Each structure stands twice: as C-alpha cells, then as structure tokens.
Design an enzyme around this catalytic site. Sequence first.
Site, PDB file in Angstrom:
ATOM      1  N   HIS A  64       3.069 -14.483 -13.408  1.00  0.00           N
ATOM      2  CA  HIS A  64       2.934 -14.996 -14.780  1.00  0.00           C
ATOM      3  C   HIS A  64       4.106 -14.552 -15.655  1.00  0.00           C
ATOM      4  CE1 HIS A  64      -1.359 -15.616 -13.566  1.00  0.00           C
ATOM      5  NE2 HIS A  64      -1.191 -16.694 -14.307  1.00  0.00           N
ATOM      6  N   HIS A  68       7.704 -18.893 -14.349  1.00  0.00           N
ATOM      7  CA  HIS A  68       6.496 -19.709 -14.384  1.00  0.00           C
ATOM      8  C   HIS A  68       6.416 -20.535 -15.683  1.00  0.00           C
ATOM      9  CE1 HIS A  68       2.323 -20.927 -14.161  1.00  0.00           C
ATOM     10  NE2 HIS A  68       2.063 -20.252 -15.266  1.00  0.00           N
ATOM     11  N   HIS A 102       2.841 -20.727 -23.199  1.00  0.00           N
ATOM     12  CA  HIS A 102       1.415 -20.739 -22.846  1.00  0.00           C
ATOM     13  C   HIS A 102       0.919 -19.487 -22.105  1.00  0.00           C
ATOM     14  CE1 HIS A 102       2.518 -21.676 -18.710  1.00  0.00           C
ATOM     15  NE2 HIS A 102       1.250 -21.489 -18.391  1.00  0.00           N
ATOM     16  N   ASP A 103       1.825 -18.694 -21.527  1.00  0.00           N
ATOM     17  CA  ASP A 103       1.459 -17.395 -20.927  1.00  0.00           C
ATOM     18  C   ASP A 103       2.209 -16.205 -21.560  1.00  0.00           C
ATOM     19  OD1 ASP A 103      -0.652 -17.869 -19.104  1.00  0.00           O
ATOM     20  OD2 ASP A 103       0.707 -18.463 -17.509  1.00  0.00           O
ATOM     21  N   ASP A 213       0.133 -26.284 -15.220  1.00  0.00           N
ATOM     22  CA  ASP A 213      -0.086 -24.867 -14.914  1.00  0.00           C
ATOM     23  C   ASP A 213      -0.350 -24.611 -13.427  1.00  0.00           C
ATOM     24  OD1 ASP A 213      -0.098 -22.206 -15.751  1.00  0.00           O
ATOM     25  OD2 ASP A 213      -2.269 -22.175 -16.045  1.00  0.00           O
ATOM     26  N   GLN A 265      -7.343 -20.931   0.105  1.00  0.00           N
ATOM     27  CA  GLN A 265      -6.515 -21.990  -0.477  1.00  0.00           C
ATOM     28  C   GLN A 265      -7.102 -23.376  -0.219  1.00  0.00           C
ATOM     29  OE1 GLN A 265      -4.414 -20.169  -2.820  1.00  0.00           O
ATOM     30  NE2 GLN A 265      -3.261 -22.025  -2.327  1.00  0.00           N
TER      31      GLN A 265
HETATM   32  O1  LIG Z   1     -10.049 -19.692  -3.943  1.00  0.00           O
HETATM   33  C1  LIG Z   1      -9.127 -18.903  -3.800  1.00  0.00           C
HETATM   34  C2  LIG Z   1      -7.932 -18.969  -4.739  1.00  0.00           C
HETATM   35  C3  LIG Z   1      -7.920 -19.907  -5.761  1.00  0.00           C
HETATM   36  C4  LIG Z   1      -6.833 -19.986  -6.645  1.00  0.00           C
HETATM   37  C5  LIG Z   1      -5.746 -19.115  -6.493  1.00  0.00           C
HETATM   38  O2  LIG Z   1      -4.673 -19.161  -7.364  1.00  0.00           O
HETATM   39  C6  LIG Z   1      -3.810 -20.237  -7.215  1.00  0.00           C
HETATM   40  N1  LIG Z   1      -3.532 -20.746  -5.991  1.00  0.00           N
HETATM   41  C7  LIG Z   1      -2.677 -21.791  -5.864  1.00  0.00           C
HETATM   42  C8  LIG Z   1      -2.086 -22.338  -7.000  1.00  0.00           C
HETATM   43  N2  LIG Z   1      -2.365 -21.826  -8.233  1.00  0.00           N
HETATM   44  C9  LIG Z   1      -3.210 -20.784  -8.365  1.00  0.00           C
HETATM   45  N3  LIG Z   1      -3.507 -20.228  -9.694  1.00  0.00           N
HETATM   46  C10 LIG Z   1      -2.344 -19.797 -10.212  1.00  0.00           C
HETATM   47  C11 LIG Z   1      -2.600 -18.755 -11.267  1.00  0.00           C
HETATM   48  O3  LIG Z   1      -3.731 -19.117 -12.132  1.00  0.00           O
HETATM   49  C12 LIG Z   1      -4.934 -19.357 -11.325  1.00  0.00           C
HETATM   50  C13 LIG Z   1      -4.687 -20.441 -10.311  1.00  0.00           C
HETATM   51  C14 LIG Z   1      -5.754 -18.163  -5.476  1.00  0.00           C
HETATM   52  C15 LIG Z   1      -6.836 -18.085  -4.600  1.00  0.00           C
HETATM   53  C16 LIG Z   1      -9.249 -17.878  -2.704  1.00  0.00           C
HETATM   54  N4  LIG Z   1     -10.437 -17.449  -2.181  1.00  0.00           N
HETATM   55  C17 LIG Z   1     -10.172 -16.507  -1.201  1.00  0.00           C
HETATM   56  C18 LIG Z   1     -11.016 -15.734  -0.331  1.00  0.00           C
HETATM   57  C19 LIG Z   1     -10.441 -14.845   0.569  1.00  0.00           C
HETATM   58  C20 LIG Z   1      -9.038 -14.706   0.634  1.00  0.00           C
HETATM   59  C21 LIG Z   1      -8.213 -15.462  -0.219  1.00  0.00           C
HETATM   60  C22 LIG Z   1      -8.799 -16.370  -1.141  1.00  0.00           C
HETATM   61  N5  LIG Z   1      -8.244 -17.236  -2.083  1.00  0.00           N
HETATM   62 ZN   LIG Z   2       0.003 -20.277 -16.662  1.00  0.00          ZN
HETATM   63 ZN   LIG Z   3      -2.484 -18.683 -18.426  1.00  0.00          ZN
END
Ligand SMILES: O=C(c1ccc(Oc2nccnc2N2CCOCC2)cc1)c1nc2ccccc2[nH]1
Ligand SMILES: [Zn+2]
Ligand SMILES: [Zn+2]
Lengths: 308, 307
Positions: A64, A68, A102-103, A213, A265
Amino acid sequence: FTLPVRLCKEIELFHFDIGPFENMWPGIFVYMVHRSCGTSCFELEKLCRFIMSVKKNYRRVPYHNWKHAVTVAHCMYAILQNNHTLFTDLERKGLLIACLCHDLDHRGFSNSYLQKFDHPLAALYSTSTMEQHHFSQTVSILQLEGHNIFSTLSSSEYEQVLEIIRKAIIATDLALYFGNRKQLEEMYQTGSLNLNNQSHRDRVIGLMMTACDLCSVTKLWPVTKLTANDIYAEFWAEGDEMKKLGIQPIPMMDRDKKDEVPQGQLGFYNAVAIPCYTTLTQILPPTEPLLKACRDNLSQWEKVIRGE
Amino acid sequence: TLPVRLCKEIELFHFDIGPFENMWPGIFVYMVHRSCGTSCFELEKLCRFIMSVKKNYRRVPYHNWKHAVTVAHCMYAILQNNHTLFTDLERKGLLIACLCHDLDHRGFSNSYLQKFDHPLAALYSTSTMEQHHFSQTVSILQLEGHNIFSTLSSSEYEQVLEIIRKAIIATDLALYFGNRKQLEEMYQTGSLNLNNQSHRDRVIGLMMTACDLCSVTKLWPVTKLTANDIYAEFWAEGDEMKKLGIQPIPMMDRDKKDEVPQGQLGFYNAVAIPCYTTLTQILPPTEPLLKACRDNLSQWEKVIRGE
Ligand SMILES: O=C(c1ccc(Oc2nccnc2N2CCOCC2)cc1)c1nc2ccccc2[nH]1
Ligand SMILES: [Zn+2]
Ligand SMILES: [Zn+2]
Ligand SMILES: O=C(c1ccc(Oc2nccnc2N2CCOCC2)cc1)c1nc2ccccc2[nH]1
Ligand SMILES: [Zn+2]
Ligand SMILES: [Zn+2]
C-alpha cells in the site's frame, strides 16, 4: 519531463505496468491528467507540488505504497479514456486525484486490526477507518500553502469535487463493495440503472474505484504473480501482529499456511474479482479487457494448483 | 406481448417490421413499454395518438408509415443497448420523434419545394419539410384526447417538445454533414461531453440520421428492395423537375437507372459509412449497424462487377 515512445503507446492499455523507476511516476501521472482532463485544468506548478507532497505521505510498506497509488490512478485513466464522454468536468478533475490519494498514510494494516489493537483512528472513525483517514489526509494536503490545485473553482464547484473524491475514497473500503455491486447488478438487469441519477452515478464510480484498486489481477501473469508477493508480505505481517495480541489470525494472514495461497486466490477471483469486472463490463463495455485479463489470471492460478 | 419470433428478433438491429400494417402500432407500443416502462403513457390515449399519426402519413413509395415505424425501431434498438445514458424524458420523446419525424411527407425534397415555389418554402426558408413535420406533430398533440404528455409538468412537457423539435430538424440531411464533422473533432480532441447540452443535442442529431438511413444496415434483400422504393420517389421528383424545364441531377433521373450501383457506392463511402463509423466511436454498442452497412457496401461492389 517528456514521455518516451514505448510509454506513450502502452499507457493507453489497461494492463500497463508503470515500471521500477520511481522518479518517472510523477511525470506519468501528469501526462495522464493532461490527456484525460486537459493542459489548462490545473496550474502545473501547484499540481507537481501537490503530487510530491502526496508522495511524501505514502509509507514504505510492501504493497500500500506510492507505486500502488499511481497504478490505481492509471487504471482509472484507462477507464476515463475509453468512456470519456460520460464524465463531468469535475469528475475528469477529481477521479484521478481521488485515486492518487486513496491510500494516503497507509500503515500496512487492515481496519479490523486497528479495531483489535485499539488504535486512535479506530476510536475517531468507527466505520471505514483507514478510508476516512485517507480522505482526511487528502483534505489536509490541499490546505497547505500553494497546494490547493482546485483554487480557481467556485465555492459550489469546490465542495462538489471534494464530495466526489470523498465518496470515491470511501468506496475503496472492500466491505462496501459487496452491497454496492449487488444493487448495481440488480439495477442493470431490471433496466432501472441510469447515469443521470446522482445516487446511481455514485455507485458506478464506487465500482470503478474497486476495479482500479484491485487492478493487479488484470495485469499480465508475471505482474499479477509478483504483485501477489507484496500483498501477502503485508497480510503475513498483520497476521504476525495478530498472534502478538493472542489472536489466531485467519488463514489469509498466516504465513504458516503459504501452501494454501493458490486456493485462496482462486476463491477470491470467483467470489470477488470476476464479479466486479463482470458487472463493470456490463455497465461500461469498453472495460472488457480488464475482465478478459482477470479470467486469464484465474486460469493461471488453477494451473498452479494442479502443479504445472 | 408479441409473438415469440418478433419478441426475440425485435432486439436485433437489422429487424424488419414485416408487411402486416395493422401489427405496426402494437410493435411500437411494445417498444415504448420496454424502453420507458409500462406506466409512461396512458395506453388508450397513446393508441389514439398513434392512429392519428398513421392517418397523417401519405401513400408514397418510401416516406410513409412503414418508414416511420422502421426508424422508431432503430432508435428503440439504440436506446436498449445504451439504456444508462438517456433519461425517461429522452426515451419517451425520441421514439415519438422518430414516429412523427416525416409527418405529411409528399415524396419530394426541400429543394424541389423551393423551386416549385410551394407555400411551405415561403413559410420555412430552411429545413422546410422538417419544420413542417414538427408543426404537424404539435397539431396532433393539440387534438382532444391526443396529448400523451398530459401527466407531465409544464417544465417537463416543454423539455420533451424541444427534444422532439431538435431531433426532427436533425433529420434534414443537409445538417448532418456539419454535425458529423463537429462530433469527429470533439471526439478526437476529447472535448466531447454528454453532460454538455449542446454536445448531447449533436449526438442525438447523429442518432436520428443513423436511424433515418437504417435501411442500409438491414440484410441485403431488405436493403435492396427498400432501394426500389427510394428511387421510385426520386425518379418521380426528377420527372417533376423536367416539368419545370429543369434538368434533374442523375440521382433523380430515371434515364440513368443503370448507374444506381455506382450512385449507391458513392453514398455509402461519403455518407453512410462515415455516419455509422462516427456513431460507433461515440456509442460502441451501435457497432452492428456499421458492420451491416459495410456488408451492404460489399454487395453494391458485387453488383457493379456483375458477380
Ligand atoms: O481469499 C484470500 C485473499 C483475498 C484477497 C487478497 O488480496 C488481494 N489479492 C489479489 C489482488 N488484490 C488483493 N487485495 C489487495 C489489497 O486490498 C485487498 C485486496 C489476498 C488473499 C485468501 N484466502 C487464503 C487462505 C489461505 C491462504 C491464502 C489465502 N488467501
Ligand atoms: Zn488501495
Ligand atoms: Zn485502501
Ligand atoms: O448518391 C446517390 C444516392 C444517394 C442516396 C439515395 O437515397 C438513399 N439510398 C439509400 C438509403 N437511403 C437513402 N435516402 C433515403 C431518403 O433520404 C435520402 C437518403 C439515393 C441515391 C445516387 N447518385 C446517382 C447517380 C446516378 C444514378 C443513381 C444515383 N444515386
Ligand atoms: Zn425526413
Ligand atoms: Zn425519414
């Protein structure tokens, strides 16, 4: 500060990566504002001073961070350029700025952790804690001497662009996206959705902010995979801090569960990302390349699960 | 409700409304109810309006009741695939405008009228027939039990009548060339903005042109058969020019009917393709109109060669 030939071409593409050279990013943002808004929207001296002050208030955190901020701004630029006739003069000024700010001042921790730790911001802002702070920082930077990039606007116009920016930054709280998309999806299917209705328009802008985002999932596979390393580096650090409070963190933030990352993911693409770009493409059809790349990355994550 | 086949194919851009005249009013009511909603107009009042509009179109080869309903369908298709852009008023008013846009057409161009010295040419020096079309629309709305916009406020009623007026006047093809050139420049520079009223009027003006020429975006048989009707009017006008001692342009001269393929080729290159090209740029969901127009240009090339 003149943009090179490869950059001028490929900055128009949704899956553009802004590169490792940090000192070109300010220039890349000005190029985007000048093409999207115009050369006479902002006084150039004020804008750069505003840009560098925003850069100074981003933190050296794994994800962040300043990179980003500009990457999210770029996704918005690509949306603006391919849906350009829809947006008001004020929206053409305020959206790119909203994305850049935004962050602002992100610590690297979720709203949930701030509540658990009992951080002062949690007491001051009950809902959307970091997001209300991000906007607060944005306003605080605008009021510095020489930093009011909106100084030539009328009082009415100034309050309107600040509201646009506020709502846009608040919409980046992922907890609000779920309800917002549901409504939009329902409004699109029953044909009630209309951009001349201000509340409907806010919801569409809110979805655009979510899409920008999350845009790391719409890049080419190597960018997506390498950006994932930075996302988890933050989550694993938050999970470490959760354990220091005596609280078992969710698998998402537990470095002891690295093995389950691909499945985590894949669950996120199905439940969050694919729906977001699906609905966005229904509302704004020229945004389809985002959806197309998200599906390609979805296929890659399940290719990693099978072990090939 | 329509029959199963029409329900499905009416959503397509290349839909043909068919030979059954007394189904056309029901086709229009259906389209109005899907774009706007089932509580926009009072049905009994809307039907009375439609039949009066029908009664004031004339029995001419091309500019007739079938043309009017066909133009309205293209607008319906455009509105349905760009549903988020337009307000309730604009959807109500544009379908109605399209239906009324050639009211009381005689089968003659503005230039013939001014050269014949027809009374309407003295009344309306520019866009002669078009100003008459709107004038006729107002007369029909003023009849007892014919004001379909009676539920609206005065403020809203005036807005939709201006929408209708501007839209009808834009169907003067002489205004299209300027309008398209301005939209192309504004689109390229990025200044084009639908929240700017004057800009919005121009886009609607281009939409009206596109719907008006939509015969070039149908399947080949429809496009070719409709051309017989268009040329029947033109040649009849060319005969009237000859009556006045004036040699008409080859376009309106029945003696030069074998140059039609080349005449159509030049029309697609200079007017039709640029119209739908510009329209697709501004409104990408109207792309099927361009593709179909490109396909019919291929057919006209195929006719010129003999293949
Ligand atoms: O759902 C998951 C998850 C969902 C979103 C995540 O963040 C992001 N991933 C890809 C793209 N963007 C993301 N974000 C960026 C920052 O703000 C939140 C969303 C990571 C894991 C997730 N669940 C898990 C269980 C075990 C091990 C690993 C796991 N990961
Ligand atoms: Zn953001
Ligand atoms: Zn944010
Ligand atoms: O360009 C012509 C032309 C352009 C437009 C025409 O009318 C339409 N054709 C197809 C679709 N729509 C048309 N209009 C519909 C009614 O309003 C005017 C345009 C005909 C010939 C044209 N030039 C000719 C020379 C010799 C012989 C024949 C010629 N034809
Ligand atoms: Zn006409
Ligand atoms: Zn017409």
